[PDB]
Design a protein around this motif. Structure first.
Motif, short mmCIF file in Angstrom:
data_model
loop_
_atom_site.label_atom_id
_atom_site.label_comp_id
_atom_site.label_asym_id
_atom_site.label_seq_id
_atom_site.Cartn_x
_atom_site.Cartn_y
_atom_site.Cartn_z
N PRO A 1 -14.15 -6.79 -42.42
CA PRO A 1 -14.90 -5.94 -41.48
C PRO A 1 -15.59 -6.71 -40.36
N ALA B 1 -14.92 -6.68 -36.38
CA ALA B 1 -15.95 -6.56 -35.35
C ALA B 1 -15.74 -7.58 -34.24
N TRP B 2 -15.34 -8.80 -34.61
CA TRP B 2 -15.03 -9.80 -33.59
C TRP B 2 -13.79 -9.43 -32.78
N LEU C 1 -12.89 -6.33 -32.16
CA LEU C 1 -13.36 -5.27 -31.28
C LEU C 1 -14.11 -5.82 -30.07
N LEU D 1 -12.94 -5.58 -26.17
CA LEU D 1 -13.76 -4.94 -25.15
C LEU D 1 -14.06 -5.89 -23.99
N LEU E 1 -15.12 -4.42 -20.26
CA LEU E 1 -16.21 -3.48 -20.50
C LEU E 1 -17.48 -3.94 -19.80
N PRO E 2 -18.08 -3.13 -18.94
CA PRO E 2 -19.32 -3.54 -18.28
C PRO E 2 -20.49 -3.53 -19.24
N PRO E 3 -21.54 -4.32 -18.97
CA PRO E 3 -21.72 -5.28 -17.87
C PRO E 3 -21.22 -6.69 -18.13
N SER E 4 -20.12 -6.86 -18.86
CA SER E 4 -19.63 -8.21 -19.13
C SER E 4 -19.05 -8.83 -17.86
N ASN F 1 -28.97 -4.19 -36.91
CA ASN F 1 -28.40 -5.51 -36.71
C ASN F 1 -29.20 -6.62 -37.36
N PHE F 2 -30.45 -6.37 -37.73
CA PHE F 2 -31.30 -7.39 -38.35
C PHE F 2 -31.53 -7.08 -39.82
N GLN G 1 -22.80 2.79 -40.41
CA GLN G 1 -21.98 2.49 -39.24
C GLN G 1 -21.78 3.74 -38.37
N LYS H 1 -25.02 4.38 -36.59
CA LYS H 1 -25.12 3.33 -35.58
C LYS H 1 -24.27 3.63 -34.36
N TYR H 2 -23.01 4.02 -34.58
CA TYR H 2 -22.12 4.34 -33.47
C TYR H 2 -22.59 5.56 -32.70
N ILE I 1 -27.96 6.02 -20.54
CA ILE I 1 -27.77 5.07 -19.45
C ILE I 1 -26.99 5.72 -18.32
N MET J 1 -17.38 4.40 -27.00
CA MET J 1 -17.88 5.03 -28.21
C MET J 1 -17.09 6.28 -28.55
C1 LIG Z 1 -31.60 -14.76 -24.10
C2 LIG Z 1 -32.19 -13.84 -25.15
C3 LIG Z 1 -31.49 -12.51 -25.21
C4 LIG Z 1 -31.95 -11.58 -26.31
C5 LIG Z 1 -31.23 -10.23 -26.36
C6 LIG Z 1 -29.77 -10.29 -26.82
C7 LIG Z 1 -28.73 -10.19 -25.70
C8 LIG Z 1 -27.31 -10.02 -26.19
C9 LIG Z 1 -26.88 -11.04 -27.23
C10 LIG Z 1 -25.60 -10.67 -27.97
C11 LIG Z 1 -25.58 -9.23 -28.45
C12 LIG Z 1 -24.58 -8.94 -29.55
C13 LIG Z 1 -24.94 -9.58 -30.88
C14 LIG Z 1 -24.24 -8.94 -32.05
C15 LIG Z 1 -22.73 -8.89 -31.91
C16 LIG Z 1 -22.02 -10.11 -32.45
C17 LIG Z 1 -22.19 -10.25 -33.96
C18 LIG Z 1 -21.82 -9.02 -34.73
O1 LIG Z 1 -20.79 -8.40 -34.60
O2 LIG Z 1 -22.78 -8.70 -35.59
C19 LIG Z 1 -22.61 -7.51 -36.39
C20 LIG Z 1 -23.84 -7.48 -37.26
C21 LIG Z 1 -24.20 -6.09 -37.68
O3 LIG Z 1 -23.09 -5.53 -38.41
P1 LIG Z 1 -22.92 -5.53 -39.99
O4 LIG Z 1 -22.80 -4.16 -40.53
O5 LIG Z 1 -24.06 -6.35 -40.55
O6 LIG Z 1 -21.56 -6.39 -40.20
C22 LIG Z 1 -20.46 -6.20 -39.30
C23 LIG Z 1 -19.64 -5.03 -39.77
O7 LIG Z 1 -19.00 -5.37 -41.01
C24 LIG Z 1 -18.60 -4.58 -38.78
O8 LIG Z 1 -19.23 -4.38 -37.50
P2 LIG Z 1 -19.36 -2.88 -36.90
O9 LIG Z 1 -18.07 -2.37 -36.40
O10 LIG Z 1 -20.03 -2.02 -37.96
O11 LIG Z 1 -20.44 -3.02 -35.71
C25 LIG Z 1 -20.12 -3.80 -34.54
C26 LIG Z 1 -20.64 -3.06 -33.34
C27 LIG Z 1 -19.53 -2.43 -32.56
O12 LIG Z 1 -20.08 -1.68 -31.45
C28 LIG Z 1 -19.38 -1.68 -30.32
O13 LIG Z 1 -18.34 -2.26 -30.18
C29 LIG Z 1 -20.07 -0.89 -29.25
C30 LIG Z 1 -20.39 -1.75 -28.03
C31 LIG Z 1 -19.90 -1.15 -26.72
C32 LIG Z 1 -20.55 0.16 -26.34
C33 LIG Z 1 -22.07 0.11 -26.29
C34 LIG Z 1 -22.63 -0.84 -25.25
C35 LIG Z 1 -22.24 -0.51 -23.82
C36 LIG Z 1 -23.03 -1.26 -22.76
C37 LIG Z 1 -24.48 -0.79 -22.61
C38 LIG Z 1 -25.51 -1.73 -23.20
C39 LIG Z 1 -25.72 -3.02 -22.42
C40 LIG Z 1 -26.64 -2.87 -21.22
C41 LIG Z 1 -28.01 -2.30 -21.56
C42 LIG Z 1 -29.05 -2.49 -20.46
C43 LIG Z 1 -29.54 -1.21 -19.79
C44 LIG Z 1 -28.46 -0.41 -19.10
C45 LIG Z 1 -27.73 -1.17 -18.04
O14 LIG Z 1 -21.31 -4.04 -32.48
C46 LIG Z 1 -22.65 -3.99 -32.40
O15 LIG Z 1 -23.32 -3.19 -33.00
C47 LIG Z 1 -23.18 -5.03 -31.47
C48 LIG Z 1 -24.39 -4.57 -30.68
C49 LIG Z 1 -24.45 -5.21 -29.31
C50 LIG Z 1 -23.20 -4.96 -28.48
C51 LIG Z 1 -23.25 -5.53 -27.08
C52 LIG Z 1 -22.08 -5.09 -26.22
C53 LIG Z 1 -20.73 -5.50 -26.78
C54 LIG Z 1 -19.54 -4.83 -26.11
C55 LIG Z 1 -18.65 -5.76 -25.29
C56 LIG Z 1 -19.31 -6.30 -24.03
C57 LIG Z 1 -19.97 -5.23 -23.20
C58 LIG Z 1 -20.66 -5.75 -21.97
C59 LIG Z 1 -21.61 -6.92 -22.21
C60 LIG Z 1 -22.91 -6.54 -22.88
C61 LIG Z 1 -23.98 -7.61 -22.77
C62 LIG Z 1 -25.32 -7.21 -23.35
C63 LIG Z 1 -26.41 -8.21 -23.04
O16 LIG Z 1 -24.91 -8.02 -36.43
C64 LIG Z 1 -25.67 -8.99 -36.95
O17 LIG Z 1 -25.63 -9.32 -38.10
C65 LIG Z 1 -26.55 -9.62 -35.91
C66 LIG Z 1 -26.42 -11.13 -35.89
C67 LIG Z 1 -27.40 -11.80 -34.96
C68 LIG Z 1 -27.26 -11.38 -33.51
C69 LIG Z 1 -28.04 -12.25 -32.55
C70 LIG Z 1 -27.94 -11.79 -31.11
C71 LIG Z 1 -28.39 -12.83 -30.10
C72 LIG Z 1 -27.48 -14.04 -30.01
C73 LIG Z 1 -27.85 -14.99 -28.88
C74 LIG Z 1 -28.58 -16.24 -29.33
C75 LIG Z 1 -29.26 -16.98 -28.19
C76 LIG Z 1 -30.40 -16.21 -27.57
C77 LIG Z 1 -31.52 -15.90 -28.54
C78 LIG Z 1 -31.73 -14.41 -28.79
C79 LIG Z 1 -31.84 -14.06 -30.26
C80 LIG Z 1 -32.06 -12.59 -30.54
C81 LIG Z 1 -32.16 -12.29 -32.01
#
Ligand SMILES: CCCCCCCCCCCCCCCCCC(=O)OC[C@H](COP(=O)([O-])OC[C@H](O)COP(=O)([O-])OC[C@H](COC(=O)CCCCCCCCCCCCCCCCC)OC(=O)CCCCCCCCCCCCCCCCC)OC(=O)CCCCCCCCCCCCCCCCC
Ligand SMILES: CCCCCCCCCCCCCCCCCC(=O)OC[C@H](COP(=O)([O-])OCC[N+](C)(C)C)OC(=O)CCCCCCCCCCCCCCCCC
Ligand SMILES: CCCCCCCCCCCCCCCCCC(=O)OC[C@H](COP(=O)([O-])OCC[N+](C)(C)C)OC(=O)CCCCCCCCCCCCCCCCC
Ligand SMILES: CCCCCCCCCCCCCCCCCC(=O)OC[C@H](COP(=O)(O)OCCN)OC(=O)CCCCCCCCCCCCCCCCC
Ligand SMILES: CCCCCCCCCCCCCCCCCC(=O)OC[C@H](COP(=O)(O)OCCN)OC(=O)CCCCCCCCCCCCCCCCC
Ligand SMILES: CCCCCCCCCCCCCCCCCC(=O)OC[C@H](COP(=O)(O)OCCN)OC(=O)CCCCCCCCCCCCCCCCC
Lengths: 87, 155, 459, 99, 177, 13, 128, 558
Positions: free
Chosen positions: C353, C357-358, C360, C364, C369-372, H23-24, H116, H119-120, H130, H150
């Motif tokens: 799973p 997710a990776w 997916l 994307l 997918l924006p804003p990437s 996510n946390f 999930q 979450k979705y 947005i 989504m």
């Molecule tokens: C500088 C500091 C910055 C701090 C803020 C952070 C900024 C962004 C950092 C990265 C964000 C993504 C991180 C998680 C994804 C990767 C890992 C993963 O898959 O984990 C799943 C896992 C949760 O799932 P699980 O159930 O436990 O296991 C996986 C499942 O088996 C199976 O998985 P599943 O299918 O059940 O669920 C997967 C699900 C699937 O969901 C999706 O595929 C839906 C996503 C697309 C549609 C929704 C978003 C559309 C765009 C709007 C939002 C963005 C703009 C918002 C702003 C306002 C409007 C403009 O993905 C998520 O829920 C991920 C949420 C975030 C998605 C971000 C967009 C990804 C789409 C592709 C790129 C889009 C454009 C770029 C976006 C850039 C954003 C900054 O997450 C974790 O365990 C989290 C791990 C730790 C994450 C740390 C994040 C920060 C890392 C950077 C380190 C350095 C800076 C320090 C900051 C530290 C903060 C703590």
């Protein structure tokens, strides 16, 4: 929701359907009564009985299995196979 | 895998055709290749272009989602005839009859919208009347120039 | 730049004097330290480039490619350490030495002040890549690719060499800084037409161009994972970097010599994307996707507007990260099922799973997918090509349908549906593999927060 | 015709094995053996502290910068009193009444 | 046509399948139950009019234009059962049907969460591996020369043995995990 | 009562 | 009488309305029995490897390997340049390139002529 | 001022907080669906205050709070536009989503991936708010592609099923064909107006705006399932019931309509764009309502219902009445989400039975579901002084009394009759008559989650049109003078549709078996449009993607 099926339940429901059938008498009907040889039915009647099973339990028996179910016990065993009863 | 189970050039002699049909694991009578025009298919069997949606679903398949068996010579466009893609299945209405009904329906609706755009419906009224020289300063008129007087009268 | 070349060279005594169980850990640690060091190149200015010496300089075009290059080495050391476990220790150190030597060539290829030092380092990068691909490629069947490499040498790098020596005799220098102020307009003549083809065709094959992309779904297939990562991530982008340097000298003849090749790319991304819809080989599908994305960079360089250069360098960085992650996902299934056939192992979200997710997230980012920054680069190139011609949006948008179509198909085939029955060696995800996917994806996601550092010298 | 005796025997043997497998998929009363591991805190953690954060952000970082929060000026009617000035807006013209 | 045991469809099977498909498509045409039951006895009479036809060529032709009748009168979207192929709930839980060997890839900290289950799974696998070579040497002496003719497998003959090729049929996932 | 075991892959790693 | 179903490339004829499905001849019995025999033999050869406990890996399918080798490798060494291959590689090879070439060249010459004649509304066009 | 913008941002940050929570995570959750439902309830309560203080003064603003990028003349900032459209859409969307999640805590209870799923569904809600609050084209494209992705992930929820993946890829295909036109509009505004911001687009006010409005009409075609790019919305019923309830009835599918309502100062000065919107909307509201007459899956019928209502929304934009269209969005959300919830309550009660030909006798078996289904159908058709009366009838009261394409008006009225036809068809085959479902009755609805979730949207479907239409200010002049045969148009056409379909339904009890007509075969196989183009356009792609593209040119000649 989704109640569990038992061989008592599947047996009683299959016999309950066959006792509401006007070519099978409810006194000669057993759990091993063969449709063609013991109850004296047609293959057309056998297809109607398997379609009545499909109407009863809400799924479909395919024709490669519907052409061979020749007793109520085979029907109960086939629904036991396709429903995983007595876990 | 080794070489004598891999595809080769076009079968010319009938014994090479028999060796290929043994290699491709099918009958020699069913085994026909693609015609040697030079398009590079090689000795691959020309399967009769049936989509995998058409197959028996209740049959015990090796690949149930593909509706495909092990060792079966696949179709050349097997990536194309999966059930997520192109289907060739029979339909209740004929193919040309579907194309005729769709084209007649779409073109007739386009023509009727063109007829209704040619002849528009409206209300038995005059135009909507606005004060202050047809709202000249509101609609972006410059304050230094002065337009013609747009005067409306009672009725 | 000598604070980066010397640690990259000190990775050679670090990799040959290390203990036999420690050679991956030490090289990964010190290459991650070099990648942390690589952020000092962000001292850029709005008027002046960062000019270190007579030999090396860095504007905002070369700087993100340098950071991506110095970041790519630890990821390649992680990706390539599993399938070299039964390798000889000396051959393993030879592999690591060729990777280090390729990084050493690249980080002074991108900073080359003068263009023939760029040519020497540019054609120096082919040799460790060649040796990595042909000594660790797990099968070598290159009967048609030999003649194509001969075609690359004939139609490519050698006319570039003769053309650069000609500019050295005419202008008196090949310093890019001097050529910013001593550039003459290159007028319409046949001499200048062969001059333009000589200055451009090497970088056209390196991008690759459509019709000239015949090498890339072979060299990506017959390679190890580190070779495919460095081909997708950096070694295509040498062509775009070299075009953005050499099109300074090719004005204004470019304004009518770009018209064939622009067609070759604008139709070409329609074809190769469509080619990805009929790929049995997953690694070949990612290769044709790389062609379908570098076609936009070719168009954006050839139309030479500011928005097109900004979009092209953002697309180069983003596609480097994204396609490197896609090849790493393809390897993370190939190390289990031992075949690259995309229809072999299906339904993998039932089994893995987090890895799905990776898949997916990489899909994307692959479909922008924006804003990437994939979308930022894609979008700015599309805006600039609309300013070039208002009809091209069709050829943009249709590509942006098919680019979605194979991106999710690669997701739907490999991860969704019913799992394959006769495959039972599908292990859970190793922490190495998930770390590799995260070190691809999390920089790619963080660059959406601050994209201004990957938009080139004319942001 | 139905099944052969071979097919009925095979279905009976497979059915016995299948029912044994399905019965043996059951659970023990100890299973799962787990390892050894404020009424309105929702409105405090999820609302009130974010209202504090966003009010600090908008009050001291966003509105302190020009044109970031631009607001449509309020709708002025005849008869209003202006708070910044103290000036009373005069009413409209008297109505040529219709009813 | 395409079947695991027989290489064809007998004429009796073709008649029964056409009768069944005709009744199913009819029930799709004829939604209400008393109305369908009336037309169902009418259609049963139409099928029993030529039940006693001895000539197999004439019955072949009658079956052929009966297929033409069924194709001319078919419903475009017939009622498919939800878990029947073409249904709305068909193969819905296949994403939840994890194969059993994945239990072998668990970590021992979560294998110890269910001790009786894996302690019994060990002797299930033991049973499979001491049954395998006996059922292979069973199949190698019963299969004719040239391979098996039909896809059907023989049962367990001796007492103590298990039927050949049994592990994936017995240990298959449940239809509602 | 009659709790059933859900076969799933290893969520430990 | 009845409307006969028309088969198509994307609408195949059903199994029921095909006449050759209703063949009763003994040579069709031989062909169907040989197809059932090959299918049963390949099924047995598969599920002896599939149900084997000592195997833990991938039951390799040489038809699938053969399919991928046909879709990738066998494309060049069975090519012959003739009239059909050259004309079809000239139609879809240099056809639409020339098409989009003249379309985009025409539109850009039109736009350049309108700009150098002061016609094109390039008023607020300062991003490019 | 300091209250409005603060609670505006607090709503969106509050919606994003359970994404950080999921996510946390390390533990197994203490009812994370209840946590997300509580969060979205409180986000509704939070967004109510800016809506009330907008209804007080008309207070609109912009929050351009975070500078993100400056491409030389284009300052892309994180900019939220709080206008009338956001202030009426955000409480309606949060209220509907809150009812959908209390529905889903019952319906999706057997799913082991329930966290999930929630979450979705929250990710969809975040991307949608947005979309509807964005002030530039780039943030709107972020929300646009977000609700598209989504939509993909929630159609293909049962990812093992082939048809769900097929429908999800189909929806992505048609939405990206709409995205061609959206990117065309962004390209035109950047080149000719130097902006993606709405304010500079509206203030410059271009005149040669045919090409960007054609791009926006293609975007709304891809997004709101207009004719040509429609069939993914009936295909998208392969996902779960709260997916089709929230996303593909009431919230996502109005975003192309919302995109065209958002650009109303360009459409009000371009008659050609109004005419194209009127023709395309009338074509869609004819075609999908005609296809709905002869279907048997209840989710398909209610999806054709919502696509016909989207076509009617496109019609009333095309008569230059955008605020009536947006009032119809805010109205339509309540009863169409409630109709999908009641249909899925029937489906889950009858053990995954969706075909209406095996239903019936549910007037007294499921009384609350029957009550709310009748109320939703009557709000759909235009019963007097339900919520669907306060917009849709006014649409007809402006579609008659305007300079209108006459055939578009006549097809609009035929669609208005067809709405009554398929509504009483649903009530006939699903609620009335005698039972047709199988024999083991497991019919039950006595969960407070299901009953309260249908109850709050029932209060909405009764009172919300009255409340909203008496709380919104005038932005046009309502045309209120018309003859009596023209005022009584929509009611009489709706009642004629009821009478005609009751005669059709009472011809089914007769003991006659007729051969199928060509109109029945046309409308049952969906105008033959998903049967041809889903076979032909892939074929002509993929052979061309193999024979000439891969094999001929890029493996041999080149
Ligand atoms: C500088 C500091 C910055 C701090 C803020 C952070 C900024 C962004 C950092 C990265 C964000 C993504 C991180 C998680 C994804 C990767 C890992 C993963 O898959 O984990 C799943 C896992 C949760 O799932 P699980 O159930 O436990 O296991 C996986 C499942 O088996 C199976 O998985 P599943 O299918 O059940 O669920 C997967 C699900 C699937 O969901 C999706 O595929 C839906 C996503 C697309 C549609 C929704 C978003 C559309 C765009 C709007 C939002 C963005 C703009 C918002 C702003 C306002 C409007 C403009 O993905 C998520 O829920 C991920 C949420 C975030 C998605 C971000 C967009 C990804 C789409 C592709 C790129 C889009 C454009 C770029 C976006 C850039 C954003 C900054 O997450 C974790 O365990 C989290 C791990 C730790 C994450 C740390 C994040 C920060 C890392 C950077 C380190 C350095 C800076 C320090 C900051 C530290 C903060 C703590
Ligand atoms: C790529 C395909 C074309 C490659 C051509 C070979 C490299 C040319 C490099 C540029 C040399 C140059 O200055 O050209 C202008 C010079 C012009 O001569 P010149 O510069 O000495 O002349 C003095 C200046 N003018 C022109 C004002 C009188 O071109 C040539 O001398 C010949 C150029 C063509 C080379 C033909 C042989 C190779 C054919 C293609 C092989 C691939
Ligand atoms: C629980 C979490 C909350 C934190 C709790 C602990 C801290 C307590 C709360 C107080 C916080 C500290 C004070 C306030 C913050 C600092 C304010 C400030 O001036 O910060 C400097 C700046 C403000 O911008 P600026 O205008 O000053 O500078 C921009 C920088 N230049 C000029 C170089 C371009 O940054 C921030 O405020 C960062 C936060 C932004 C919030 C939104 C992030 C969204 C990310 C999306 C990525 C993709 C975007 C795509 C869309 C773009 C538009 C279309
Ligand atoms: C307001 C203005 C309005 C203008 C209207 C006119 C312009 C638009 C014209 C229509 C374009 C869209 C229709 C044609 C393509 C549709 C493809 C599709 O949706 O395929 C679906 C199909 C499965 O569908 P279905 O049969 O329902 O499956 C369930 C059971 N099998 O799925 C498959 O078979 C899988 C196929 C995968 C590969 C797809 C290959 C085809 C790609 C088509 C791209 C079209 C690009 C158009 C660009 C236009 C630019 C201007
Ligand atoms: C094959 C691999 C896949 C594809 C990769 C690319 C391969 C080909 C690369 C070159 C592409 C075509 C050549 C570039 C075209 C640029 C415009 C041009 O030359 O137009 C044709 C020319 C028109 O005349 P004109 O340009 O005015 O010539 C006077 C110049 N001062 O017409 C003429 O002058 C008549 C023709 C003269 C011969 C020209 C030969 C040199 C160009 C090809 C090398
Ligand atoms: C809203 C006002 C509804 C009442 C006024 C219209 C009455 C009418 O014309 O009803 C037509 C019809 C009843 O007449 P009919 O069904 O032919 O005869 C059997 C009588 N039970 O049918 C009906 O009364 C049923 C349809 C009523 C529609 C109500 C929603 C509009």
């Amino acid at each position: 929701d989704a109640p569990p099926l038992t061989l008592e339940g599947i047996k009683d429901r299959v016999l309950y359907v066959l006792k509401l059938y006007d070519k099978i008498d409810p006194e000669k009907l057993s759990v091993n009564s063969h449709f063609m040889k013991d109850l004296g039915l047609d293959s057309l009647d056998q297809v109607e009985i398997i379609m009545a099973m499909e109407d009863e339990f809400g799924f479909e028996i395919p024709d490669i299995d519907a052409e061979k179910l020749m007793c109520p016990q085979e029907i109960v065993d086939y629904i036991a196979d396709k429903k995983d009863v007595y876990e | 895998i080794t070489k004598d189970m891999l595809p080769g050039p076009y079968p010319k002699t009938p014994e090479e055709r028999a060796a290929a049909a043994k290699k491709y694991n099918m009958r020699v009578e069913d085994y026909e290749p693609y015609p040697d025009d030079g398009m590079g298919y090689g000795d691959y069997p020309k399967l009769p272009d049936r989509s995998q949606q058409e197959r028996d679903p209740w049959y015990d398949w090796d690949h149930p989602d593909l509706r495909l068996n092990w060792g079966e010579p696949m179709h050349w466009d097997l990536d194309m005839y999966i059930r997520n893609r192109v289907d060739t299945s029979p339909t209740p209405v004929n193919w040309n009859l579907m194309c005729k009904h769709l084209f007649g329906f779409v073109a007739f609706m386009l023509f009727m919208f063109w007829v209704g755009e040619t002849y528009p419906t409206y209300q038995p009224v005059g135009p909507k009347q606005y004060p202050y020289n047809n709202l000249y300063l509101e609609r972006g008129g410059d304050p230094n120039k002065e337009p013609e007087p747009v005067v409306h009268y009672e009725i | 730049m000598l604070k980066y070349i010397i640690p990259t060279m000190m990775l050679m005594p670090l990799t040959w004097l290390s203990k036999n169980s420690m050679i991956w850990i030490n090289t990964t640690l010190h290459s991650l330290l070099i990648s942390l060091t690589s952020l000092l190149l962000l001292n850029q200015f709005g008027d002046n480039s960062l000019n270190f010496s007579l030999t090396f300089f860095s504007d905002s075009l070369s700087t993100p490619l340098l950071i991506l290059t110095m970041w790519l080495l630890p990821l390649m050391l992680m990706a390539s350490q599993h399938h070299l476990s039964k390798e000889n220790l000396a051959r393993k150190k030879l592999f690591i030495s060729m990777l280090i030597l390729l990084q050493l060539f690249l980080i002074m290829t991108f900073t080359a002040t003068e263009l023939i030092f760029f040519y020497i380092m540019f054609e120096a990068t082919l040799v460790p890549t060649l040796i990595i691909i042909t000594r660790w490629g797990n099968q070598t069947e290159r009967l048609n690719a030999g003649l194509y490499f001969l075609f690359y040498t004939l139609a490519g790098s050698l006319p570039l060499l003769v053309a650069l020596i000609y500019i050295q005799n005419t202008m008196g220098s090949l310093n890019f800084l001097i050529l910013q102020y001593w550039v003459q307009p290159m007028p319409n003549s046949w001499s200048n037409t062969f001059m333009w083809l000589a200055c451009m065709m090497a970088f056209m094959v390196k991008m690759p161009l459509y019709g000239l992309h015949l090498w890339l779904p072979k060299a990506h297939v017959e390679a190890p994972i580190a070779g495919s990562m460095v081909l997708a991530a950096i070694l295509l982008k040498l062509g775009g970097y070299g075009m953005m340097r050499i099109t300074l000298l090719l004005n204004p003849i470019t304004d009518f010599m770009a018209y064939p090749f622009i067609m070759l790319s604008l139709w070409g991304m329609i074809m190769t994307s469509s080619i990805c819809l009929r790929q049995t080989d997953l690694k070949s599908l990612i290769a044709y996707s790389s062609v379908s994305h570098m076609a936009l960079v070719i168009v954006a360089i050839l139309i030479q507007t500011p928005w097109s250069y900004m979009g092209a360098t953002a697309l180069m960085i983003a596609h480097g990260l994204t396609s490197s992650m896609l090849f790493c996902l393809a390897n993370s299934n190939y190390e289990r099922v031992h075949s690259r056939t995309m229809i072999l192992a299906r339904g993998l979200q039932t089994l893995l799973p987090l890895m799905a997710a990776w898949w997916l997230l990489a899909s994307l980012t692959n479909l922008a997918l924006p804003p990437s920054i994939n979308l930022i680069g894609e979008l700015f190139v599309v805006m600039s090509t609309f300013s070039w011609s208002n009809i091209t949006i069709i050829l943009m948008g249709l590509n942006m349908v098919i680019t979605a179509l194979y991106s999710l198909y690669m997701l739907i085939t490999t991860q969704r549906g019913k799992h394959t029955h006769h495959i039972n060696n599908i292990l859970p995800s190793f922490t190495r593999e998930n770390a590799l996917m995260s070190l691809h994806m999390l920089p790619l996601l963080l660059l959406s927060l601050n994209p201004k550092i990957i938009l080139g010298p004319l942001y | 015709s139905g099944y052969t005796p071979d097919e009925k025997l095979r279905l009976q043997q497979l059915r016995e094995l299948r029912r044994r497998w399905l019965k043996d998929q059951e659970l023990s009363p100890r299973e799962p053996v787990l390892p050894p591991r404020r009424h309105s805190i929702f409105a405090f953690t999820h609302v009130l502290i974010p209202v504090w954060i966003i009010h600090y952000y908008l009050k001291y970082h966003v509105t302190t910068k020009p044109y970031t929060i631009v607001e449509k000026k309020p709708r002025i009617f005849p008869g209003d009193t202006i708070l910044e000035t103290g000036e009373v807006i005069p009413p409209m013209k008297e109505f040529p009444d219709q009813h | 046509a395409f079947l695991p045991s027989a290489a064809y469809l007998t004429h009796q099977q073709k008649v029964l399948q056409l009768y069944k498909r005709a009744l199913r498509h009819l029930e799709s045409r004829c939604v209400h139950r008393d109305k369908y039951r009336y037309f169902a006895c009418l259609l049963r009479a139409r099928f029993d009019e030529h039940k006693n036809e001895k000539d197999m060529v004439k019955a072949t032709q009658l079956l052929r234009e009966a297929e033409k009748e069924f194709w001319h009168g078919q419903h475009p979207q017939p009622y498919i059962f939800p878990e029947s192929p073409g249904g709305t709930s068909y193969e819905r839980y296949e994403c939840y049907k994890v194969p059993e060997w994945c239990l072998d890839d668990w970590h021992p900290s979560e294998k110890a969460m269910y001790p009786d289950y894996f302690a019994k799974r060990e002797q299930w696998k033991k049973l499979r591996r001491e049954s395998w070579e006996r059922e292979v040497k069973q199949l190698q002496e019963e299969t004719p020369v040239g391979g098996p003719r039909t896809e059907a497998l023989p049962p367990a003959r001796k007492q103590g043995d298990l039927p050949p090729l049994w592990w994936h049929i017995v240990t298959r996932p449940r239809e509602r995990p | 009562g009659k709790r059933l075991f859900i076969i799933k892959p290893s969520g430990f790693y | 009488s009845f409307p006969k179903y028309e088969p198509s490339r994307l609408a195949s004829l059903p199994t029921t309305l095909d006449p050759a499905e209703y063949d009763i001849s003994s040579e069709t019995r031989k062909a169907q029995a040989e197809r059932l025999a090959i299918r049963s033999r390949l099924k047995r050869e598969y599920q002896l490897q599939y149900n084997d406990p000592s195997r833990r890996g991938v039951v390799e399918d040489p038809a699938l390997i053969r399919w991928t080798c046909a879709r990738s490798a066998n494309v060049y060494p069975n090519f012959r340049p003739n009239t059909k291959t050259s004309l079809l590689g000239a139609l879809f090879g240099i056809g639409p390139l020339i098409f989009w070439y003249y379309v985009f060249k025409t539109d850009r010459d039109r736009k350049e002529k309108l700009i150098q004649e002061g016609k094109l509304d390039r008023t607020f066009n300062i991003s490019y | 001022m300091n209250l409005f913008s603060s609670l505006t941002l607090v709503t969106l940050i509050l919606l994003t907080m359970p994404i950080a929570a999921i996510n946390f995570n390390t533990h197994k959750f203490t009812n994370y669906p209840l946590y997300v439902k509580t969060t979205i309830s409180c986000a509704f309560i939070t967004s109510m205050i800016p809506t009330m203080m907008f209804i007080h003064t008309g207070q609109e603003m912009i929050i351009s709070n975070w500078h993100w990028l400056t491409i030389q003349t284009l300052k892309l900032s994180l900019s939220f536009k709080m206008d009338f459209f956001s202030m009426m859409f955000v409480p309606v969307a949060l209220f509907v989503t809150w009812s959908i999640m209390e529905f889903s805590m019952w319906y999706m209870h057997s799913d082991p991936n329930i966290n999930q799923f929630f979450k979705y569904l929250l990710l969809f809600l975040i991307t949608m708010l947005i979309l509807v609050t964005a002030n530039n084209l780039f943030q709107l494209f972020i929300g646009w592609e977000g609700v598209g992705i989504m939509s993909f992930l929630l159609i293909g929820w049962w990812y093992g099923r082939t048809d769900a993946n097929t429908a999800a890829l189909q929806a992505i295909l048609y939405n990206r064909i709409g995205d061609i036109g959206f990117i065309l509009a962004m390209a035109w505004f950047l080149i000719n107006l130097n902006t993606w911001d709405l304010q500079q687009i509206f203030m410059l006010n271009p005149n040669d705006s045919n090409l960007p409005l054609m791009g926006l009409i293609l975007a709304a075609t891809g997004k709101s399932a207009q004719f040509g790019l429609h069939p993914w919305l009936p295909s998208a019923m392969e996902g779960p019931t709260p997916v089709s309830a929230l996303l593909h009835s009431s919230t996502m599918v109005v975003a192309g309509i919302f995109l065209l309502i958002r650009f109303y100062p360009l459409t009000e000065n371009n008659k050609f764009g109004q005419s194209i919107m009127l023709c395309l909307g009338a074509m869609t509201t004819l075609f999908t309502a005609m296809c709905a007459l002869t279907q048997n899956d209840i989710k398909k019928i209610i999806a054709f219902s919502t696509s016909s209502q989207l076509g009617l929304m496109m019609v009333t934009i095309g008569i230059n009445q955008p605020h009536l269209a947006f009032l119809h969005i805010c109205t339509h959300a309540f009863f169409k989400a409630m109709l999908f919830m009641c249909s899925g309550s029937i489906i889950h009660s009858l053990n995954d039975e969706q075909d209406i030909r095996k239903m019936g006798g549910l007037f007294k078996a499921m009384p609350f579901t029957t009550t709310a289904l009748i109320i939703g159908s009557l709000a759909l058709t235009g019963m007097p002084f339900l919520t669907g009366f306060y917009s849709k009838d006014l649409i007809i009261e402006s579609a008659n009394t305007s300079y209108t394409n006459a055939w578009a008006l006549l097809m609009t009225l035929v669609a208005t009759s067809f709405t009554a036809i398929y509504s009483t068809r649903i009530i006939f085959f699903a609620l009335l008559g005698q039972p047709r479902f199988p024999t083991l009755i497991n019919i039950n609805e006595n969960n407070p989650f299901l009953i309260n979730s249908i109850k709050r949207l029932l209060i909405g479907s009764l009172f919300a049109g009255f409340i909203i239409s008496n709380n919104i200010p005038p932005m046009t002049i309502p045309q209120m003078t018309m003859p009596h045969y023209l005022k009584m148009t929509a009611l009489t056409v709706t009642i004629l549709g009821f009478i005609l379909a009751l005669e059709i339904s009472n011809t089914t009890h007769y003991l006659k078996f007729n051969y199928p007509s060509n109109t029945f075969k046309f409308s049952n196989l969906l105008g033959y449009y998903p049967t041809i183009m889903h076979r032909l356009t892939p074929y002509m792609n993929l052979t061309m993607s193999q024979k000439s593209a891969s094999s001929l040119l890029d493996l041999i000649w080149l």
